[PDB]
Amino acid sequence: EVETFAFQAEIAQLMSLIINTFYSNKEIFLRELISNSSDALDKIRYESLTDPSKLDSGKELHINLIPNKQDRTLTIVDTGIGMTKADLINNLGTIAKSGTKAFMEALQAGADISMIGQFGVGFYSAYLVAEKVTVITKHNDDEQYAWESSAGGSFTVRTDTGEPMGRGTKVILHLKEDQTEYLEERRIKEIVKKHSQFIGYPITLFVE
Ligand SMILES: CSc1nc(-c2ccc(C)cc2C)c2c(C#N)c[nH]c2n1
Numbered sequence: 001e002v003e004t005f006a007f008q009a010e011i012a013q014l015m016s017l018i019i020n021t022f023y024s025n026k027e028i029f030l031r032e033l034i035s036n037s038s039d040a041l042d043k044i045r046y047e048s049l050t051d052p053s054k055l056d057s058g059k060e061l062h063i064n065l066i067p068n069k070q071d072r073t074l075t076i077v078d079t080g081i082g083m084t085k086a087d088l089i090n091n092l093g094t095i096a097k098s099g100t101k102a103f104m105e106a107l108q109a110g111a112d113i114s115m116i117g118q119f120g121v122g123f124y125s126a127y128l129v130a131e132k133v134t135v136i137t138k139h140n141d142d143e144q145y146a147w148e149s150s151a152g153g154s155f156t157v158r159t160d161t162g163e164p165m166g167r168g169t170k171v172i173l174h175l176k177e178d179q180t181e182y183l184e185e186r187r188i189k190e191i192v193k194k195h196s197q198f199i200g201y202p203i204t205l206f207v208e
Contacts, residue, residue: 040080
């Protein structure tokens, strides 16, 4: 069943900072998560220009936004390259130790939280609006895994059973009680239009 890991001290810190720092422009979380999905989809793309059997786990390269009012969740699904178990543990494939260093320094020197994606740690912006984040992932080589964290210094990794996905990553944001605006069609559309309107892959906003 479930393995528990300690975040590296630098990530544990960034996350406390993201969670605790007063910052009203929370919406940038969606641009950062769509920008990582797009990066993951560029990667599966690049790979398949030399090995087309890579697209056998699925040819459609896209991004879905799925809000669920009853579960209070907003899910970003992509059919990107996915992460193997080691990717997920090595904090979701990021240089997060060195990025938090560069980021926390960039903040000292006049940056604001909205620039987080320049240091390749934009994922953690999910903790502006979510109390809990589950990342379900499937890379061609490996199993389907679930990663989960409610911050506080640890995360879990397990094998995910059932809901097979073929290839990619889902980020499920369990929203905080007072960030439910991010479940509204109108607000999601406004934010994609403000910050993500020239992404290179179709983004579909699901209706409830
Ligand atoms: C390289 S495969 C991959 N990785 C990520 C991702 C990247 C970095 C981090 C810290 C976390 C995730 C889930 C996403 C992601 C996010 N966030 C959305 N799709 C993704 N696909």
